[PDB]
Design an enzyme around this catalytic site. Structure first.
Site, short mmCIF file in Angstrom:
data_model
loop_
_atom_site.label_atom_id
_atom_site.label_comp_id
_atom_site.label_asym_id
_atom_site.label_seq_id
_atom_site.Cartn_x
_atom_site.Cartn_y
_atom_site.Cartn_z
CG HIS A 351 -1.32 2.66 0.18
ND1 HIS A 351 -0.21 2.73 1.00
CD2 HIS A 351 -2.20 1.85 0.81
CE1 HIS A 351 -0.42 1.99 2.07
NE2 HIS A 351 -1.62 1.45 1.98
CE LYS A 542 10.46 5.33 -8.09
NZ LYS A 542 11.29 5.93 -7.02
NE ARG A 543 5.90 -3.24 -11.20
CZ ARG A 543 4.87 -4.08 -11.07
NH1 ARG A 543 4.73 -4.80 -9.97
NH2 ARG A 543 3.98 -4.20 -12.05
CE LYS A 548 6.45 3.75 -9.11
NZ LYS A 548 6.84 4.33 -7.79
CB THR A 650 9.07 3.00 0.91
OG1 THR A 650 8.82 2.06 -0.14
CG2 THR A 650 7.75 3.40 1.57
CE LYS A 654 12.51 -0.04 0.46
NZ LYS A 654 12.07 -0.89 -0.64
C1 LIG Z 1 -3.52 0.34 -4.61
C2 LIG Z 1 -2.71 1.31 -5.50
O1 LIG Z 1 -1.45 1.64 -4.81
C3 LIG Z 1 -0.31 0.97 -5.21
O2 LIG Z 1 -0.26 0.11 -6.10
C4 LIG Z 1 0.96 1.29 -4.54
O3 LIG Z 1 1.84 0.42 -4.50
N1 LIG Z 1 1.10 2.52 -4.01
C5 LIG Z 1 2.33 2.89 -3.36
O4 LIG Z 1 2.24 2.62 -1.91
C6 LIG Z 1 3.48 2.99 -1.23
C7 LIG Z 1 3.31 2.63 0.26
O5 LIG Z 1 2.37 3.54 0.88
C8 LIG Z 1 3.76 4.53 -1.45
O6 LIG Z 1 4.99 4.91 -0.82
C9 LIG Z 1 3.89 4.80 -2.95
O7 LIG Z 1 4.12 6.21 -3.17
C10 LIG Z 1 2.57 4.39 -3.64
O8 LIG Z 1 2.66 4.60 -5.08
C1 LIG Z 2 11.19 -0.37 -1.52
C2 LIG Z 2 10.74 -1.16 -2.79
C3 LIG Z 2 9.79 -0.64 -3.68
C4 LIG Z 2 9.15 0.78 -3.53
O1 LIG Z 2 10.04 1.70 -4.17
P1 LIG Z 2 9.58 3.21 -4.54
O2 LIG Z 2 10.73 3.78 -5.27
O3 LIG Z 2 9.03 3.88 -3.35
O4 LIG Z 2 8.42 2.96 -5.57
C5 LIG Z 2 9.50 -1.32 -4.81
N1 LIG Z 2 10.09 -2.51 -5.08
C6 LIG Z 2 10.98 -3.06 -4.22
C7 LIG Z 2 11.52 -4.46 -4.51
C8 LIG Z 2 11.32 -2.39 -3.07
O5 LIG Z 2 12.24 -2.94 -2.19
#
Ligand SMILES: CCOC(=O)C(=O)N[C@@H]1O[C@H](CO)[C@@H](O)[C@H](O)[C@H]1O
Ligand SMILES: *Cc1c(COP(=O)(O)O)cnc(C)c1O
Ligand SMILES: CCOC(=O)C(=O)N[C@@H]1O[C@H](CO)[C@@H](O)[C@H](O)[C@H]1O
Ligand SMILES: *Cc1c(COP(=O)(O)O)cnc(C)c1O
Lengths: 810, 810
Positions: A351, A542-543, A548, A650, A654
């Protein structure tokens, strides 16, 4: 009320009402005279839950009968959010419950807001697991989600003085009506001890035992009567634990702390012992459960035919040596056979490519906590490197690069290398990410075993991310193409023939306006904040992380503010810039970025000259339930990570499915989204991955941009001088220093192109009709991003099972 | 089956069966194909529980309507045992459930054995609280039991190598179907901090907060449709607790440890900080609840008219200064008025005279943990001693003797003195005990305020201790005098007219034989041990303590064994000597006594010459559920504490009501029991209290008895030489040394008379008809010992409320 929410039959509404009153009385032990809203929520939850049990019991009985191949999705995170509405949607009970509660004089939407989010995840990785469970159930796969039942999930974020404050997420306080404890299936997990080599095989002895108690939660498929299981383990001390007397009992806490709290890090590895214990805890309990179920169907040759184990990143990587341990030490299989079975059973999903996120556990830690596993890992490494040596004779550097054991200050085990060696399939989560894995970090492995590498572009479930959070949009869509798209999202392409339909254009725009009004009202209700519903809703949720680039967004905001101050009586498209997300507790820079955002708001939101033309709001405590509210209300989706850093993303999917246009870099899934909708219908800007590489080869010098871009210089000088922190002039010194001297993510490099692109966004927003037509083209082509498509690919290309859309008898 | 177990109507049995299947399906989420006995037990428990809710809700609604004076019974212990059968008995559902389960193909008695005991008590004091709750509900009093929901109750006792081993009593593991969490009523409790004196009153600030979450358990009255509440508090940390991040969350355990485990001491004070926290925790949460309920009826003058607080020993003594704190500091009442209210509201019950059992808390502990309460206690003491000084001018020693503050090495607060000063009533638990309180330990207080001192002889509930555990006896009794006695035990006196009835004599003897057979079978089932059902069942079950003198019993057993070995072919009445009870974990001598008992059994039970004429069994893990099995099966009840040490005893009453004759000293309630049945129908022996005093004045010299009693000398020499511990010759050196040089309980002094009395017991047992006739005279006169009589006296003489036998509408 609305079609997609099901029928409200006379019999059903009457039945729901009586069962609601039954639970309020017998289950909650209350009467309408003392019942509180929370009591009503639980009465409703238990009522809906009852409808799940029948299907749940027969689904499991079904799998026992047909004995299909089982899919085990191992993850340390399952970001589920709320369960009530999702359950009603999948059971087609929403309108009936809405009517039933209405007749009881209650507002169902009010009751839904009472449920606590099951925040057992950090962000993308945890949410993906949740979307996947929904899709696997909807596609009729015999799938099981296995994880940990954290007592405390992701912390609740409070903003004090503009700073993030963390508070415990005691989500189980009032109880969880959805789970069912299964103490009868409690299993022992071993830690520490030592290895003893006997006449026949090694033995792991003198270990400390911790019990794993499972809690099962139903996972309903979309209207197909399938209900799968998500089993989460809870840590319990044995009763003879430490058995002065009082202290021994109090010390049981030491063992039970394993399932106490979720580590709050996003894309960051923290090598703490407690985390390692959590990882082995879930793996050890799960594998015993898997083998038990397999035997209750000696012939382990068929194990891979009946079992598939998907590792969500390397967190559950110990499943590989644990499976070997069980087969070799306990079942007495020869190594080679055990290994064959293990490889064919396991598959690994990566990931991220950020170096700081990769798990590399110190050998001394494994040595003390899991002595037998370390021995098995060394043996695996030895046999693996022998294979590398035979394929690339004399290539000594390749041997050290591919070793599972990393040398240096402290020896470490590279868990990603362990996963690739012991899995028959390795996949990235977006086309560009999977290609990067083969070209860079896993290049050596790809050369040795090209067949193992695959791509499985991420997706989101259209149930929670469309029907549930945006009923208004789901309805106008169903009005023209039916309801079939909810479980076959590709059908949204049929909406392309309505791009010129004046009626549809008006309905799409109206739904968005209604969502914005609703959200605008919400901000004042629970957060007392005023905003202009007519402005463009520019959001980035997002986090919080440097990659980012919430900082790039901040630079644009300040640019907009300075331009207004320069020419006050000049017209500009009004915007409400919303930024939200949590920062890991120990991530200093991330916490400074949150403070900067609120600081900017403090200045911008109170400047008389700006008026209601620009607002900057920081969305507190961003979580799944909040995402369901803000995403349907967004106009512009900010997906601006530096090219090559966001594996997939992801949240981006959305926003696209809910009627927002996207401004972003050619990173992660953004590339495929633009490809699906057409680049002309996307706002792409910035460096491509190749451009980033060229810059690194040459050397990134932020000073150059600062010297050649007057507007950028002004912003940096304002930050340094204390313009956004009067009382504390050097408050943001760390941010400026990083930006100017060691910015790993090249914020300045994409500044000019970003600002320019944003101008094009404002230009299109001034033309309502054309903005909406572009929105329709995005929604219409978002079908590929349904997690149903993703899961069908995993099923056919990795697990070797066929997805089914056939309903089960109710 | 039997009359007293209620009717098994067609409608009810059908209804029970369907609700049983409903819970198995919807509540337990299982089907008859995978359900285990435990699943069936829970299905039945939830089914019976449903029948309680209606009555529970209306009983509480009733109290709100009529607003009667409320009785609050504060105790740190509630030794409840199992709840299923008791609930069926009080709701008259036993036969119906028996039939319903029978038709489902299940054995109800088997399912009842699955329920875990709610062992939230140590022994007599905790069991009394449980019997009292049953009686208060049966007498229609608006009563509430308030305590702590310990996660771990009294430890489970395992016997290894003849030694006691303790293991955690994880009684909540599989869940508790009887309780209902009430998180909505969570209250804050304060600790530490400091006192700040302002312009108007003192303020307690900078405190650490711990939340008290209540769990309610229904307490059904006997067939009167009344269901009272027992509210137990659970400790919870606030969410901002300690809020690196991970550690802060893990440290929540520190606060929640307050309700983690019950201190396992019987008649022994251990001045540990955690115990003090538990005591204040229950008092603080309870008083806020009481005041809240009182206001929901400003005029605190009527507080004593609407509230009665009964302190079960000094454990909840902090209720006195806490009530003063609230009235003075929070409500702003003047001291004198607050004190008047407090005294009229509180009443204190003393349960022992042993010096080591009295609570005397170090001032430095209260000073740090509860600074405001210490100040209030000093003020109370000052005003109290001023009263003493005025009543006994110049008597300076009386002042130091009556002070709440004890001087010396470390200053301590005498909690008993605090209780007497702040209560309008003080009572002992048996006539002799209450007299001793006035003549000795509380003599000074009695002289100052004679009106405060009362007696309330203990009692036991005839529901659990007759109908529930001995249905066979309850039935033959009901056959001749009806069922009215179950709630009016005095009616058993009518059985005196059947003492010569040949039919009754035979039925009584038959019931006993059946109980012995059943118990004899149980011993082999769960403990694989053989015993002769024709022998006299000689049993002593109660906590292990030197004052209870299990050692005297041991001496007799060894005497019997030596006499047999001396004259093998001489006839002796066969006996099965059963001794059981737990020893506090840190009570060394008590643990040595358990080892001695098993050691004696090891020798006696394997001596070919003895045969089946003498058996010595140690009953493992004695608890409420075990008491319900062994007591109905006993022939001889051992109540042999040194005169003046057993405040009352309640086990003694249980044996008398179930057909066992009693051998005991004139101690505690034994005196009143003998008085009720007639001394000729009791086996009394040993020194009276006056005899013990004479011996102390002269000086107790054990050597004298050793020198003048040959049989005693032999036993001591056998113990010392290693006769009962071949491998470890001096294993019992501590026991012999104590017996010979510092026996506070004069074991040797009662030896001769005890052995002689035991011979008279064996003589009567040889005459079945006369033994049974004496048994009938005991059962017939046990009416006074019903806790219904005890509670009616508390109600009229202390609480100022009238008991009611009127049923409430179902
Ligand atoms: C284990 C380190 O990866 C993470 O903390 C993490 O949340 N990665 C996340 O996983 C998502 C689902 O595949 C991807 O869409 C995001 O781009 C990725 O940053
Ligand atoms: C979908 C979702 C994420 C992932 O968002 P990205 O912009 O792909 O990092 C993170 N937090 C919450 C609560 C979400 O619903
Ligand atoms: C607080 C110290 O008292 C005890 O531990 C205790 O259990 N005392 C017991 O209370 C029972 C109920 O009144 C009495 O019958 C017993 O004689 C007494 O020892
Ligand atoms: C009744 C009872 C007691 C009290 O017995 P005494 O002989 O009065 O000390 C102790 N333990 C249990 C389990 C009881 O049922």
């Amino acid at each position: 009320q609305i079609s997609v929410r099901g029928l409200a039959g006379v019999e059903n509404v009457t039945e729901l009402k009586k069962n609601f009153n039954r639970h309020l009385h017998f289950t909650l032990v209350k009467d309408r005279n003392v019942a509180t809203p929370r009591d009503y929520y639980f009465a409703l939850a238990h009522t809906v839950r009852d409808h799940l049990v029948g299907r749940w019991i027969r689904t499991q009985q079904h799998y026992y009968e047909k004995d299909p191949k089982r899919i085990y999705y191992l993850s340390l995170e399952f970001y589920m959010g709320r369960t009530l509405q999702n359950t009603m949607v999948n059971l087609a009970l929403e309108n009936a419950c809405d009517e039933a509660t209405y007749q009881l004089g209650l507002d169902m939407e009010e009751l839904e807001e009472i449920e606590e989010d099951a925040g057992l995840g950090n962000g993308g990785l945890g949410r993906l697991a949740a979307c996947f469970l929904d899709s696997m159930a909807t596609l009729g796969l015999a799938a099981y989600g296995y994880g940990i039942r954290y007592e405390f999930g992701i912390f609740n974020q409070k903003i004090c003085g503009g700073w993030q404050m963390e508070e415990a997420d005691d989500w189980l306080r009032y109880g969880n009506p959805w789970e069912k404890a299964r103490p009868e299936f409690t299993l022992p997990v071993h830690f520490y001890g030592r290895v003893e080599h006997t006449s026949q095989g090694a033995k792991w002895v003198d270990t400390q035992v911790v019990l794993a108690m499972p809690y099962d939660t139903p996972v309903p498929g979309y209207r197909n009567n399938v209900v799968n299981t998500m089993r989460l383990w809870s840590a319990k001390a044995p009763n003879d634990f430490n058995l002065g007397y009082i202290q021994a009992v109090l010390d049981r806490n030491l063992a039970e702390n394993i399932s106490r709290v979720l580590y709050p890090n996003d894309n960051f590895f923290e090598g703490k012992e407690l985390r390692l214990k959590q990882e082995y805890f879930v793996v050890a309990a799960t594998l015993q459960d898997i083998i038990r179920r397999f035997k209750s169907s000696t012939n382990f040759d068929a194990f891979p035919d009946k079992v598939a184990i998907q590792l969500n990143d390397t967190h559950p990587s110990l499943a590989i040596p644990e499976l070997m341990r069980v087969l070799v030490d306990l079942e007495r299989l020869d190594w080679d056979k055990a290994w064959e079975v293990t490889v064919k059973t396991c598959a690994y999903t990566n990931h991220t490519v950020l170096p700081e996120a990769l798990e590399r556990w110190p050998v001394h830690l494994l040595e003390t906590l899991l002595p037998r596993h370390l021995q098995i890992i060394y043996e695996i490494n030895q046999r693996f490197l022998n294979r590398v040596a035979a394929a690339f004779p004399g290539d000594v550097d390749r041997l050290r690069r591919m070793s599972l054991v990393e040398e240096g200050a402290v020896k470490r085990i590279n868990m990603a290398h362990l996963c690739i060696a012991g899995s028959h399939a390795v996949n990235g989560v977006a086309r560009i990410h999977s290609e990067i894995l083969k070209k860079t970090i896993f290049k050596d492995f790809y050369e040795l075993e090209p067949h193992k590498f695959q791509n499985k572009t991420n997706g989101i479930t259209p149930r929670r991310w469309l029907v549930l959070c945006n009923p208004g949009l789901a309805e106008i869509i169903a009005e023209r193409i039916g309801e079939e798209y909810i479980s076959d999202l590709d059908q949204l392409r049929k909406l392309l023939s309505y791009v010129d339909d004046e009626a549809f254009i008006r309905d799409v725009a109206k739904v968005k306006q209604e969502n914005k009004l609703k959200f605008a009202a919400y901000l004042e209700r629970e957060y007392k904040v005023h905003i202009n519903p007519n402005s463009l809703f520019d959001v980035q949720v997002k986090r919080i992380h440097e990659y980012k680039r919430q900082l790039l967004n901040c630079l644009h905001v300040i640019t907009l503010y300075n331009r207004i101050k320069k020419e006050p009586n000049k017209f500009v498209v009004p915007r409400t810039v919303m930024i939200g997300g949590k920062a890991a507790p120990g991530y200093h820079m991330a916490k400074m970025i949150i403070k900067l955002i609120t600081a900017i708001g403090d200045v911008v939101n109170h400047d008389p000259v700006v008026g209601d033309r620009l607002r900057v709001i920081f969305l507190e405590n961003y979580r799944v339930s909040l995402a369901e509210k803000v995403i349907p209300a967004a106009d512009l989706s900010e997906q601006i990570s530096t090219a090559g850093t966001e594996a997939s993303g992801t949240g981006n999917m959305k926003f696209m499915l809910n009627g927002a246009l996207t401004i972003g870099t050619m990173d992660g899934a953004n590339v495929e989204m633009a490809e699906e909708a057409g680049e002309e219908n996307f706002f792409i800007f910035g460096m491509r991955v190749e451009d980033v590489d060229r810059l690194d080869q040459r050397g990134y010098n932020a000073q150059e941009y600062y010297d050649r871009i007057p507007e950028l210089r002004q912003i940096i000088e304002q930050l340094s001088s204390g313009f956004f922190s009067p009382k504390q002039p050097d408050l943001f010194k760390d941010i400026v220093n990083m930006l100017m001297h060691h910015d790993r993510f090249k914020v300045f490099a994409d500044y000019e192109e970003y600002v320019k692109c944003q101008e094009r966004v404002s230009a299109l927003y001034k033309n309502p009709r054309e903005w909406t037509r572009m929105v329709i083209r995005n929604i219409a082509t978002s079908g590929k991003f349904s997690s149903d498509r993703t899961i069908a690919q995993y099923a056919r290309e990795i697990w070797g099972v066929e997805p089914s859309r056939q309903r089960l008898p109710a």
